[PDB]
């Protein structure tokens, strides 16, 4: 036989029923979104059309991303969208020579950064690209707050974002408790990234982390039926008295 729905649509059918259907809307929108990441290991064409030198005709051109493999140790650092390239090569760059397996790995470094919103230093593993991206954003806080999820490519970088956004919405006074003025000045620099706490508490969470959260928000011992019937009784007696 045949399936009513295609198989590639089964994952989005699970978000229509069950506890996932009871999740916030803004979080569900951020999941189905498939925005393209920023190119790292390949150069884009820059335009949509080009003139093929062989025939001199205006041909269309498309940017095809290169598959990137992110190891699990990449989610404990900030690699800047870099990863391992699992591919092949031709010996001596000769198509007529045999083809070999080649893996290109990035150069990693153990540096120490400081966050102004969190007032804490982290010893993260990074690449040279991440260091340059932090210099273009003029700090680690802007890099974490400006860069999207598909370009951060790190669970730790997305957990920092949630940590920063929660202090910009809650206006946490734990930041420099003894320096009110200094604290206020810090929140006046990142005021363009302020997001309501309700929406900033679901940022970065995966589908497995959100379901567990939503489950805890709905977990509550069932109400005894002794109380329900008393309410119906008292409410019913009062209505009876009026008719009398």
């Amino acid at each position: 036989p045949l399936h009513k729905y295609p198989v590639w649509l089964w994952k989005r059918l699970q978000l229509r029923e069950g506890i996932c259907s009871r999740l916030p809307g803004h979080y569900l929108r951020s999941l189905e979104e498939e925005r393209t990441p920023t190119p790292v290991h390949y150069r884009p064409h820059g335009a949509k059309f080009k003139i093929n030198p062989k025939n001199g005709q205006r041909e269309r051109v498309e940017d095809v991303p290169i598959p990137i493999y992110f190891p699990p140790e990449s989610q404990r650092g900030l690699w800047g969208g870099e990863g391992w390239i699992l591919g092949q090569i031709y010996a001596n760059n000769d198509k007529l020579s045999k083809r070999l397996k080649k893996v290109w790995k990035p150069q990693l470094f153990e540096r120490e950064f400081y966050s102004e919103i969190l007032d804490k230093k982290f010893t993260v593993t990074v690449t040279m690209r991440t260091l340059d991206l932090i210099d273009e954003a003029y700090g680690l806080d802007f890099y974490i707050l400006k860069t999207p999820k598909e370009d951060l490519c790190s669970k730790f970088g997305m957990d920092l974002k949630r940590g920063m956004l929660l202090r910009l919405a809650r206006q946490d006074p734990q930041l420099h408790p003894e320096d009110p003025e200094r604290r206020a000045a810090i929140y006046d620099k990142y005021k363009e990234f302020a997001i309501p706490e309700e929406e900033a508490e679901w940022v970065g969470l995966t589908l497995e982390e959100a379901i567990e959260k939503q489950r805890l928000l709905e977990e509550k011992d069932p109400v005894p039926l002794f109380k329900i019937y008393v309410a119906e009784l008292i409410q019913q007696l009062q209505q009876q008295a009026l008719s009398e």
Partner: peptide, 18 residues
């Protein structure tokens, strides 16, 4: 049922106190 047991035993005492 639970409702049947509530009206038989618990309700009379509540009505009296009400």
């Amino acid at each position: 049922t639970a409702a049947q047991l509530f009206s038989e035993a618990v309700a009379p005492a509540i009505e009296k106190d009400f």
